[PDB]
Paper text:
We had previously shown that the HK [name], a member of the HisKA_3 family, undergoes important conformational changes to switch between phosphatase- and phosphotransfer-competent states. We now report the crystal structures of the DesKC:[name] complex, trapped in the phosphatase and the phosphotransferase functional states.
Note best fitting with a one dimer DesKCH188E (chains AB) to one monomer [name]-REC (chain C) model. The structures show the RR REC domain adopting identical conformations in both phosphatase and phosphotransferase complexes, presenting active- and inactive–like features in different regions of the protein, arranging the RR’s active site for phosphoryl group migration. The β4α4 loop in [name] plays a key role in these controls, remodeling its configuration in concert with [name]-association. This loop, acting as a phosphate lid, is open in the phosphotransferase complex, enabling the transfer reaction. Taking into account that phosphotransfer is a nucleophilic substitution at phosphorus, the reaction coordinate distance (i.e. between phosphorus and the entering atom, before the transfer reaction has begun) strongly suggests that P~[name]→[name] phosphotransfer occurs through a largely dissociative, or ‘loose’ mechanism: a reaction coordinate distance of ≥4.9 Å provides room for a fully dissociated metaphosphate intermediate. The small number of interactions and low surface complementarity that we observe in the several DesKC:[name] complexes are consistent with the observed ‘slippery’ nature of the protein:protein interface, displaying significant shifts in the relative positions of both partners. Further supporting that this ensemble of conformations is functionally relevant, molecular dynamics simulations of the phosphotransferase complex recapitulated the gliding shifts of one partner with respect to the other, reaching the different arrangements observed in the crystal structures at different moments of the simulations.
Numbering used by the authors:
A (entry chain C): 1 to 131
B (entry chain B): 154 to 368
C (entry chain A): 155 to 332, 335 to 367
The structure:
C-alpha cells in the first residue's frame, strides 16, 4: 500500500483528489494539507511514500516545500494547472520525481504515483518547453 | 499652415501609444484573474466529473452530488466571465449594432455608422427597447427597401437618445403604413409607452427617427 | 503646498482617462472569451445536469455524457492555457533569442553574457523592455552598418537596465527623437523609466525601468 500526503490550498480540489486516489486498491491518503509548511511538517514527521504537491499555496509554495524535502526519502509529485516560466527548472533542481497537470485524467495520476515508486521520473510534456 | 495638422497627428499618435500600454496592463490583470477563476474551476470540473464517472455504479448518490457541483461550478465560471465587464454600460445596443452589420452585409447593403459616437448611461430597459427598434428598422430595410445603402446615427441629445435609420431604397407602404401587430406601429407603441417617439420620412427612401428618454 | 492639490487633480484626470481604455479593453476581452468558451461551459453544465438525471435510469448514458463533459472541459482548459499565455506578451528571455537570430542573419557579431539577470520583473515592465530591446536591435540592423552589437541586461539597485551598443555610425540629426527613438522614450517614461543615447563611438542606448 502506497501512503500519500496531498498538499493543495483549494479545498474543493484537495477533497476531490483524495477521493480520486482513495479509489485505488494499492493507495492510501494518510494526510491532507493546504500549505507548503503542512507538507514539510507531515513528511518530516509521518514520512509517507509520496507527497502530491500543488505549487502556489499560501505561506510556502510546493516548490519551496519540495526544496526543504529534497534530502528526505519521500517521492514528491508536483501538480499544477499552468506552466509559469522557470517552474520546470526549479522543480527538477529540487529533485521533484513527478511534475504533472492537475486536470490530467485520474488514471494518469495513479500511474505516475506507481512509476515514481518504481524509481521513474514522470514529467508532463506540456509542462516542459513545448512545440 | 497645415503644419499644425502634422503636430495634432504627432500627439494622437503618442496618446494612442500610451493607450496601448494601459490596455496591455489590463490584459495582464485579466489573465491573472482567468488563471485562478477559470483555470481552477475547469481543473475542478475535470476531476469532479472524472470521479463522478468512477462512482456511477459504486455510489450513484455521490456521483449525483459531484455532478450537482460540476454544473454549479460551470454555471458560475461562465458568470465570472460575464462579470469581467463590471458595467453592462451600453452593451445590449452595442451587441445589436453587431447583429445589424451582419444582416446588412449578408443583404449586400452598405452600412454607414460611427461606432465611437454611441451612447452609454441609458437605462437597461430603454437600451433594450432601442435595440429592439433598431433591429426592426433594419429588418424593414432588408425586407422592403431594395436599398444599396443604410445609415444609422445614434446621438445623446439633452435627455433623449435619438436613433435615425435611413436608407436609399423606395418606400413600399400605403398612405397609412402603421398596421396593428406589425413593426412600424409596434415600434411606435413600445416607444410611446416609454415616453419616447417614432417619426417617419418616406420622401428620399425611408428614414425613421426614434427617441427615448435617457433615464 | 497648493501644488500637492494640483497633483491630486492631475492624478485623478489621468486615472479617469485610463479607466475609459480599461473599460473598453474589458468590454472587448469579455465578448471574445464568451465567444470561444460561452458555449463550451454551457454545454458542460447541461451534459452534467443530464448525466445526473440518467444515473439511476440509464447509468450507461450517464457514463457516455460524463466522458463528453470531461473531454469538453480538458479542451476548454487547454484553450484558456493558450489565451492566458498570449495575454501575457513577449517574454524578455524570448526576445533575447529573437535578437540573436536577427543579428546573426544580418552578419553582426552579438556580444552578450548573463550577469545580474532580473529575478522578478512585472509582466508589463518585462513586455515594455522586450519591445524596446527589439526596436534598439531593428535600428542597429537597418541603420548602423555595425559589425558588432553588445547587449547588457542587469538588475541594478531598483531598476532593470538594458544597454544596446553598436560599432557602426549614427545616422540621425542633432535631435533624433521624432518613430522608434521617441516611441521607446515615451513608453519607458510612462513606466517611470528612462532612455539615454550616446552617439559618439557608434550608438549606445541605455534604457532603465523600475523593478
Ligand atoms: N425601409 C423600408 N423601405 C421601404 N418600404 C418600407 C420600409 N419599411 C417599411 N416599409 C413598408 O411599410 C410596410 C409596413 O411595415 P411594418 O413594419 O409595419 O410591417 P412588415 O411588413 O415589416 C411585417 P413585420 O414588421 O411584423 O415583420 C412594409 O410592409 C413596407 O411595405
Ligand atoms: N543604431 C543606429 N545606428 C545608426 N543610425 C541610427 C541608429 N538608430 C537610429 N539611427 C538614426 O536615427 C534615426 C531615427 O531613428 P528611429 O528609430 O526613431 O526612426 P526610423 O528611421 O528607424 C523609423 P521607425 O523607427 O519607426 O522604423 C534613424 O532614421 C537613423 O538615421
Ligand atoms: K484505498
Ligand atoms: Mg417590419
Ligand atoms: Mg527605428
Amino acid at each position: 500500500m502506497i501512503s500519500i500526503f496531498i498538499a493543495e490550498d483549494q479545498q474543493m480540489l484537495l477533497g476531490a483528489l483524495g477521493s480520486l486516489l482513495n479509489l485505488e486498491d494499492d493507495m492510501e491518503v494518510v494526510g491532507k494539507g493546504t500549505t507548503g509548511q503542512d507538507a514539510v511538517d507531515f513528511v518530516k514527521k509521518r514520512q509517507p511514500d509520496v507527497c502530491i504537491m500543488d505549487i502556489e499555496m499560501p505561506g510556502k509554495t510546493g516548490l519551496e516545500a519540495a526544496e526543504e524535502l529534497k534530502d528526505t526519502g519521500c517521492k514528491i509529485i508536483i501538480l499544477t494547472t499552468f506552466a509559469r516560466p522557470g517552474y520546470f527548472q526549479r522543480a527538477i533542481k529540487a529533485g521533484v520525481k513527478g511534475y504533472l497537470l492537475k486536470d490530467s485524467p485520474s488514471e494518469e495520476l495513479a500511474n505516475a504515483i506507481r512509476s515514481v515508486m518504481n524509481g521513474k521520473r514522470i514529467y508532463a510534456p506540456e509542462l516542459m518547453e513545448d512545440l | 499652415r497645415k503644419e499644425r495638422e502634422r503636430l495634432e497627428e504627432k500627439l494622437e499618435d503618442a496618446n494612442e501609444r500610451i493607450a496601448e500600454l494601459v490596455k496591455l496592463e489590463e490584459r495582464q490583470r485579466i489573465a491573472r484573474d482567468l488563471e485562478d477563476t477559470l483555470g481552477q474551476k475547469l481543473s475542478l470540473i475535470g476531476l469532479k466529473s472524472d470521479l463522478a464517472r468512477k462512482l456511477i455504479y459504486k455510489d450513484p448518490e455521490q456521483a449525483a452530488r459531484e455532478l450537482k457541483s460540476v454544473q454549479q461550478t460551470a454555471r458560475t465560471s461562465l458568470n465570472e466571465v460575464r462579470k469581467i465587464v463590471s458595467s453592462m454600460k451600453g452593451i445590449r445596443l452595442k451587441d445589436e449594432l453587431i447583429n445589424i452589420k451582419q444582416i446588412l452585409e449578408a443583404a449586400d447593403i452598405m452600412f454607414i455608422y460611427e461606432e465611437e459616437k454611441w451612447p452609454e448611461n441609458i437605462s437597461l430597459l430603454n437600451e433594450n427597447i432601442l435595440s429592439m427598434c433598431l433591429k426592426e428598422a433594419v429588418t424593414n430595410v432588408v425586407k422592403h427597401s431594395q436599398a444599396k445603402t443604410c445609415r444609422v446615427d445614434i446621438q445623446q441629445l439633452w435627455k433623449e437618445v435619438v436613433i435615425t435609420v435611413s436608407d436609399d431604397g423606395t418606400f413600399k407602404g400605403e398612405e397609412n403604413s402603421f398596421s396593428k401587430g406589425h413593426g412600424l406601429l409596434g415600434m411606435r407603441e413600445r416607444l410611446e409607452f416609454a415616453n419616447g417617439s417614432l417619426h417617419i420620412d418616406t420622401e428620399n427612401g425611408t428614414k425613421l427617427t426614434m427617441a427615448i428618454p435617457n433615464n
